[PDB]
Amino acid sequence: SYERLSLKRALWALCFLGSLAVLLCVCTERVQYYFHYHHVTKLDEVAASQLTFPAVTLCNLNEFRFSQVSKNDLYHAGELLALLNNRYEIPDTQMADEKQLEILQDKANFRSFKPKPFNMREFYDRAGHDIRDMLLSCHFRGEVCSAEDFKVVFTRYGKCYTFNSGRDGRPRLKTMKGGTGNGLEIMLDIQQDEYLPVWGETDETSFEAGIKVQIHSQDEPPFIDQLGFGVAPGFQTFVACQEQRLIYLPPPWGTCKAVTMDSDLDFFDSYSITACRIDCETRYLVENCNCRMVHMPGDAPYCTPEQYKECADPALDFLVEKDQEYCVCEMPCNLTRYGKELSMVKIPSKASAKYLAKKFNKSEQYIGENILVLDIFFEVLNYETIEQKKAYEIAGLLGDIGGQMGLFIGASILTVLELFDYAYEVIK
Amino acid sequence: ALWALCFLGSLAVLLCVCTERVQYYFHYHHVTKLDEVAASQLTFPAVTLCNLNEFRFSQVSKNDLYHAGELLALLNNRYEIPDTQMADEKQLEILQDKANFRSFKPKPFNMREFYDRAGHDIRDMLLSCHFRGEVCSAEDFKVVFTRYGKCYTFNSGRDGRPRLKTMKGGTGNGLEIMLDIQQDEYLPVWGETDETSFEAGIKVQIHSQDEPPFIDQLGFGVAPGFQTFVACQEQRLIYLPPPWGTCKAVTMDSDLDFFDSYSITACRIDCETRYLVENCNCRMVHMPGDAPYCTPEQYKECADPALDFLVEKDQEYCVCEMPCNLTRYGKELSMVKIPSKASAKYLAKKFNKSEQYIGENILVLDIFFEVLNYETIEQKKAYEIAGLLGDIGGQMGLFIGASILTVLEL
Amino acid sequence: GLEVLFQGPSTLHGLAHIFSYERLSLKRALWALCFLGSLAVLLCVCTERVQYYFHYHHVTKLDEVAASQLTFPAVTLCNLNEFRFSQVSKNDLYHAGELLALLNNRYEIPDTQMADEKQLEILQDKANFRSFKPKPFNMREFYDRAGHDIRDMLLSCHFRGEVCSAEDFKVVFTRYGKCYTFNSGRDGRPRLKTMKGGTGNGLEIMLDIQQDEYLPVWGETDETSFEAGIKVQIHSQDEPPFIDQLGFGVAPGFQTFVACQEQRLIYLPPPWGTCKAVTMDSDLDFFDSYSITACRIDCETRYLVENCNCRMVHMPGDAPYCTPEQYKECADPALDFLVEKDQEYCVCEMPCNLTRYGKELSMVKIPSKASAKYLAKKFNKSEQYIGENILVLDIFFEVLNYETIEQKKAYEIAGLLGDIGGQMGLFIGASILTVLELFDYAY
Numbered sequence A: 001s002y003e004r005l006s007l008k009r010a011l012w013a014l015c016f017l018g019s020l021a022v023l024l025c026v027c028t029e030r031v032q033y034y035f036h037y038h039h040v041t042k043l044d045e046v047a048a049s050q051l052t053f054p055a056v057t058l059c060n061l062n063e064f065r066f067s068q069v070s071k072n073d074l075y076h077a078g079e080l081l082a083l084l085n086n087r088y089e090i091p092d093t094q095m096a097d098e099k100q101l102e103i104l105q106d107k108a109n110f111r112s113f114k115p116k117p118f119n120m121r122e123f124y125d126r127a128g129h130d131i132r133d134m135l136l137s138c139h140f141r142g143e144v145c146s147a148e149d150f151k152v153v154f155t156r157y158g159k160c161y162t163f164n165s166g167r168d169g170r171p172r173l174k175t176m177k178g179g180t181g182n183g184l185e186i187m188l189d190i191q192q193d194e195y196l197p198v199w200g201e202t203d204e205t206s207f208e209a210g211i212k213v214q215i216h217s218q219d220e221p222p223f224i225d226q227l228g229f230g231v232a233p234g235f236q237t238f239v240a241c242q243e244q245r246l247i248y249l250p251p252p253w254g255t256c257k258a259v260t261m262d263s264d265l266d267f268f269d270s271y272s273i274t275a276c277r278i279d280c281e282t283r284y285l286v287e288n289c290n291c292r293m294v295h296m297p298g299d300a301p302y303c304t305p306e307q308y309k310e311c312a313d314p315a316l317d318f319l320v321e322k323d324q325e326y327c328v329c330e331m332p333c334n335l336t337r338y339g340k341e342l343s344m345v346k347i348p349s350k351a352s353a354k355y356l357a358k359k360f361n362k363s364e365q366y367i368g369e370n371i372l373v374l375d376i377f378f379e380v381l382n383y384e385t386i387e388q389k390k391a392y393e394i395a396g397l398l399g400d401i402g403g404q405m406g407l408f409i410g411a412s413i414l415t416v417l418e419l420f421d422y423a424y425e426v427i428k
Numbered sequence B: 001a002l003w004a005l006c007f008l009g010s011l012a013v014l015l016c017v018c019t020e021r022v023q024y025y026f027h028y029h030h031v032t033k034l035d036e037v038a039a040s041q042l043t044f045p046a047v048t049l050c051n052l053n054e055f056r057f058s059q060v061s062k063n064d065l066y067h068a069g070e071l072l073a074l075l076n077n078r079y080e081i082p083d084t085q086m087a088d089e090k091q092l093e094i095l096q097d098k099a100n101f102r103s104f105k106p107k108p109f110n111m112r113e114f115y116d117r118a119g120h121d122i123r124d125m126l127l128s129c130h131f132r133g134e135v136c137s138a139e140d141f142k143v144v145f146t147r148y149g150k151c152y153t154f155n156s157g158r159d160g161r162p163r164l165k166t167m168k169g170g171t172g173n174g175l176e177i178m179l180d181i182q183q184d185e186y187l188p189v190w191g192e193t194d195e196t197s198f199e200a201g202i203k204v205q206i207h208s209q210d211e212p213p214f215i216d217q218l219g220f221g222v223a224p225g226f227q228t229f230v231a232c233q234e235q236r237l238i239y240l241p242p243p244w245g246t247c248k249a250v251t252m253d254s255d256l257d258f259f260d261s262y263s264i265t266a267c268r269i270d271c272e273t274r275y276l277v278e279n280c281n282c283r284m285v286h287m288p289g290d291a292p293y294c295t296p297e298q299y300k301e302c303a304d305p306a307l308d309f310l311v312e313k314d315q316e317y318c319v320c321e322m323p324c325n326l327t328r329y330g331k332e333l334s335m336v337k338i339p340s341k342a343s344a345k346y347l348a349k350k351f352n353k354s355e356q357y358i359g360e361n362i363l364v365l366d367i368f369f370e371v372l373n374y375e376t377i378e379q380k381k382a383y384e385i386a387g388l389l390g391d392i393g394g395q396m397g398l399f400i401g402a403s404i405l406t407v408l409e410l
Numbered sequence C: 001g002l003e004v005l006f007q008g009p010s011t012l013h014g015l016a017h018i019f020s021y022e023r024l025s026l027k028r029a030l031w032a033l034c035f036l037g038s039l040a041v042l043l044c045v046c047t048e049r050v051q052y053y054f055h056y057h058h059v060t061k062l063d064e065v066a067a068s069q070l071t072f073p074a075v076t077l078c079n080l081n082e083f084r085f086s087q088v089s090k091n092d093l094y095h096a097g098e099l100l101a102l103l104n105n106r107y108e109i110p111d112t113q114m115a116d117e118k119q120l121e122i123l124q125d126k127a128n129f130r131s132f133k134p135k136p137f138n139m140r141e142f143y144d145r146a147g148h149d150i151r152d153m154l155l156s157c158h159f160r161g162e163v164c165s166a167e168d169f170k171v172v173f174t175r176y177g178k179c180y181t182f183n184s185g186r187d188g189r190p191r192l193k194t195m196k197g198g199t200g201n202g203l204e205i206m207l208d209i210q211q212d213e214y215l216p217v218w219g220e221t222d223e224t225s226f227e228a229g230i231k232v233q234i235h236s237q238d239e240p241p242f243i244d245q246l247g248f249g250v251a252p253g254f255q256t257f258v259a260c261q262e263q264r265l266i267y268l269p270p271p272w273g274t275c276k277a278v279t280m281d282s283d284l285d286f287f288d289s290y291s292i293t294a295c296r297i298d299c300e301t302r303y304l305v306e307n308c309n310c311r312m313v314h315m316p317g318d319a320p321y322c323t324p325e326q327y328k329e330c331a332d333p334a335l336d337f338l339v340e341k342d343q344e345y346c347v348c349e350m351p352c353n354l355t356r357y358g359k360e361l362s363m364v365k366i367p368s369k370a371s372a373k374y375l376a377k378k379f380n381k382s383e384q385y386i387g388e389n390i391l392v393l394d395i396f397f398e399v400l401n402y403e404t405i406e407q408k409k410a411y412e413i414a415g416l417l418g419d420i421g422g423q424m425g426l427f428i429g430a431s432i433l434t435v436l437e438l439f440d441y442a443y
């Protein structure tokens, strides 16, 4: 009855409770929502008049030219190239090209042979196809290039070449037009006849003739085993690109790493998912095998054919399957990638067939089995942008709670005085 | 007193803004969230593949040619070989003897059996198979009848067996098969008919296991004499039901007579099947159900006309809405020459075929993930009910807050 | 109940007394403190919401809407060889010899002996100018006469299984010369529609690229390429073909499947974006309808006329066709200038409404052994010729489904006012009591 006696104090009392109820709910909802850290994406295109041409890494599918494999190399690495068994003579199986095998007989004869020093990197450098031999003609945006414009990079395919690498303090090339002309355009000889011969199915061996190619930002090392595409001989292969600029959101909204002036990677200048994974592979091999593979950076010693077989390969195989967690290599926030439409036509035309052959002193046959043209260019001089945009920033959370907090405080202040007014009366 | 002027003015404003936010709610606006999320495993997809040649020439018996001669377009409706200006005299000669019905008593015939017997055999075609470096064989392929005939789905997820997973991406770490398309068993063509094409190779569909193959429409071509790399990206799509969108609410029951799991493909096959049974009292070899297989006559005289009627001229019979939850695959095709000169002589010896044969018949198919990374594409509601109610909380904050202020006067 | 006696200790009643003398100033001081605090909040959030409005934020809405019909696109296709060797007359060789690079600027066949003795012998005869009186010459006429004839190239044509002929292909001059757009939508004729997608149910053509009519090549020049095949652009009918830049290559000896997806884009004008608001007024000298392609051709044309008092064969306008001389000495250099050294001259922004096409290229061999013998006899050619010259092109829709890609306004005016309204209306409700004490005291 002291409560009942309220005489419409009690309605005031409950209505303030009703309002404090409402305020808690709305403020909960808007704060629960803030914390899902919702985002949505903004697609756009914006025309440029210049575009920075990408890096173009390209590898022959054949790792080692047959000719350049010395008796010494065969002695150290014979088992690794699977040209020899574990007993360093020529495997039993008889499927082999008797003329080509004859040359391996001679090389693999070790009677009274004194071993010389051997180094995997040197072997790859010497034996790997030479851009100078492969590259029959080169034109960037109609201008002549030669082998001088190709920087050597060791990959898991061996001696490869990045064009417009942006390395060695030379400037990154730019296209001012789209279309078939205004790009890189190269004629390669894949030198099919220097291919390591295959007479037995092995874990190692393949039937491919051609090249793999990666188009990539200069701020990114080539990871061509995984990300590259195939170009076959006997076709001009057009590769129309679209530049794509991605902006992703860090945690808590997303997962990206903020690229800055400090790379945060032992062995590289710029953070990229590729750079990160190579850094990781390299660190881990050094740590667990006290050596690195030819294509890894650092001062460490190159693995010997035995450490390749008995330490490195097993360890890397472990790293991926049974030690996944060891290396989180998350995406950067700022990033540039390239769309690609492959299309092709036959090379050479009948009209041009007889000429090419004469000009390089090769059979017409050879041109059809060995010669390709690669036409990398921009379809359009414009880049697509793909931004993740925060759906609800703090400015908004406060905006929405803010006005309600300001008038609930105002009302609760009024209730403090009616509780002192009630107290005063009771007190007396 | 004066608060009449203010409180009405304010309640005016608040009722307006409250209707704006309700009109907005009812436009049921959405926008999309693209994301990439790195996984360490990925479920490898289903890979259905068909020879472009439906029936091996060898396996086509005199009896088959008698019943289905007009269907294979090897014969006209008079059981005669159409007058050819000039065919391959060698190939023609073998049709002469097959199509000779002197003394011939017709034996029993069944389209399904014909397809099963005559269709290319995976066991003949599949020279070499490797998943993730491991050996596979014909046991890892499941037969599916499609509108191209006897085809094979790899990693089907059917027959109990578990769905395979890639733990790394690249050229190696997926399916890698060497096929012989058996060019020499191709039905011969001496004249132009509706059926006549000039294609040699295979069609391939990469698809979710939760989805039957629709390879006539969705498959892509792979040529012989090339290793064709097919770098995929897994894409997980989430679409919004009505009123925001038109996707079909994903539930436990298929809502299709003949299929376990709802797919745009499953739905269209179900539809085609129901309609043909209803209108033609039979089904085609590749359709499910207990119905009787159509005879070559019903194929020609009932089924083909009915299907062709259904699509253009009877659109409305078949509403096959998209699932909300689903999985698709991006593809980059690229290719290199097969075999290399170095490897040419070996392949030939190893399969007892000419080097010639290898160049016209042998292909390699390399399906894999470019990166172990799935892209997500969600339609996300722009204004949920939780929010509209949140904002009319604005109205209750004045309503309660105004009445409390009125209690001070009285 | 001692608490009732003396009515609470003196200490307390005295407190209660201070309260009551002070109350009227607490009430005022608190409302001053609170009303200011609230008006502070209101001014801030109302600023924030207006700053945000003016960044004119947008975000994008992807959807896939099914349909039962789709308008089939335009398909422009060009032979990669610009001029058939046969149709090159003595007169043409005289005027344009240098342009086709069959002659140097000295009216001789470059000293080179690298060439086919048989094919060279026919150039000797043509390029003999002894006693020769030149006739009149016109680049457009030369292209029209010498360009490959669709009627010769097109061995078989089927739209959705129905037969088509050369009559169904409209001629367009491009920078590759005499080319052909199928389902152009020009000349009144209606735009074709597929009612179902898949390998059959679209355009399916067999071409002979006529390899043996290719201009012969013995010496490296800018024009010299070794390509044999065709380039193809799939494009909306509302858009001229820009096939040098946007086309893709199709090789002979393969059936090339080209599975398309229709894509409808809606982009936002300024201030949100940069697109050109659709008007039926083209605002383009030479075209009916705005496209980025139409705009760039218009520009190229205006600029060349302006700088070179002539146009190239493929450009519109009434201007005179450039002579082989003006092509070499004026036009090519000027266009090259326009792009590199005069970038800013030519502002060709994207339209807001438009339609694009996704493409998956895939291929199989042609012809099958079974069909090899037939094709050869049916066209009176070696089996050799079929493998080097014959291609099939299969353009179709993968599914009857268009994808929509809309930029949508993130914060429209309805919202800005709604929110500034809600805050202004919420502050009024709270500060009601302070309004009266501001008028009471004022009184």
Ligand SMILES: *[C@@H]1O[C@H](CO)[C@@H](O)[C@H](O)[C@H]1NC(C)=O
Binding pocket: A247, A334, A335
């Ligand atoms: C980094 O991203 C921001 C995004 O606003 C941009 O201003 C800048 O040019 C980018 N720079 C890079 C990739 O280093």
Ligand SMILES: *[C@@H]1O[C@H](CO)[C@@H](O)[C@H](O)[C@H]1NC(C)=O
Binding pocket: B238, B325, B326
């Ligand atoms: C789709 O199905 C999967 C099966 O595990 C489920 O986890 C998922 O929540 C569904 N996707 C969405 C976002 O509804």
Ligand SMILES: *[C@@H]1O[C@H](CO)[C@@H](O)[C@H](O)[C@H]1NC(C)=O
Binding pocket: C266, C352, C353
């Ligand atoms: C063009 O105008 C508007 C939107 O910009 C819309 O109705 C539709 O997307 C377009 N309509 C056409 C091309 O008929």
